[PDB]
Ligand binder design. Structure first.
Ligand SMILES: [Hg+2]
Ligand SMILES: [Hg+2]
Ligand SMILES: [Hg+2]
Length: 260
């Protein structure tokens, strides 16, 4: 459907949006930084499609204690205005806190195909986190990864990829675009299921061969995103640790952060 009339600042062809950072990958995927997007335009596009976003978290054992702050802050910052379905995977269904949700937002508790019928996009994150600023439809795309906040300025030789050729997650020293985080990725339901299927299969082959990748699921994620380039990449605004890394000039917003 057509966008409505909208009044906003004209984009300037001869003024870059950011001169301090890379805003597009060599495969022409945007790298999402503050200042690259007009959220009013994007909200319109995604609302006109009545987009539903699934947000998945695993909260096992002691980690169920992090759900309250996670969900409360998500209510304030994650996809506000859009349909959201939270999926909490937990071994303790009765310990899930009763958090008040905005309209159009729901939570399912899954004790430890349906995703295809219930949501358009899946976003997969860690529970021991909090939202501190806007995380919205600017991230949505067929497949996205997030730049690890400890490695975004590193050479590829310094990336902590799996370096043993015996592992399915093996990446040699001369290969690699970025170091993506295991704790924040997503995409269309189809692409996320493809990713998780590929990673599960690679992990089985490694297990059969007596090897475990150096950073586990993150190592396999990195191999997958090397071979299947993400259609957007999120900047470290989208997963930061202020205690460990401070607040550099390059970060105009800290959107989603570690909870000590
Ligand atoms: Hg997921
Ligand atoms: Hg896996
Ligand atoms: Hg993976």
């Amino acid at each position: 459907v057509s966008l409505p009339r909208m009044v906003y600042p004209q984009p300037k062809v001869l003024t870059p949006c950011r001169k301090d950072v890379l805003v597009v990958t060599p495969w022409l995927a945007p790298i999402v930084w503050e200042g690259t997007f007009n959220i009013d335009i994007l909200n319109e596009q995604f609302r006109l499609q009545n987009t539903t976003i699934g947000l998945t978290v695993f909260a096992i054992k002691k980690y169920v204690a992090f759900l309250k702050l996670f969900l409360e802050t998500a209510e304030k910052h994650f996809m506000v205005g859009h349909r959201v379905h939270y999926y909490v995977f937990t071994d303790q269904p009765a310990a899930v806190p009763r958090v008040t949700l905005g309209t159009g937002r729901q939570l399912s508790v899954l004790e430890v195909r349906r995703f295809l019928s219930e949501v358009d996009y899946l976003v997969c994150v860690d529970v021991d986190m909090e939202f501190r600023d806007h995380v919205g439809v600017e991230i949505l795309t067929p497949l996205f990864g997030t730049l690890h906040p400890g490695f975004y300025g590193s050479s590829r030789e310094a990336f902590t990829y799996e370096r043993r050729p015996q592992s399915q997650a093996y990446i040699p020293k001369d290969e690699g675009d970025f170091y993506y985080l295991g704790g924040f990725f997503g995409g269309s339901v189809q692409e996320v299921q493809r990713l998780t299927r590929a990673c599960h299969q690679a992990m089985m082959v490694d297990q059969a061969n007596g090897i475990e990748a150096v950073w586990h699921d993150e190592s396999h994620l990195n191999k997958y995103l090397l071979r299947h380039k993400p259609t957007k990449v999120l900047s470290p605004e989208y997963l930061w640790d202020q205690q460990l890394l401070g607040w550099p000039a390059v970060l105009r917003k800290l959107r989603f952060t570690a909870v000590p």
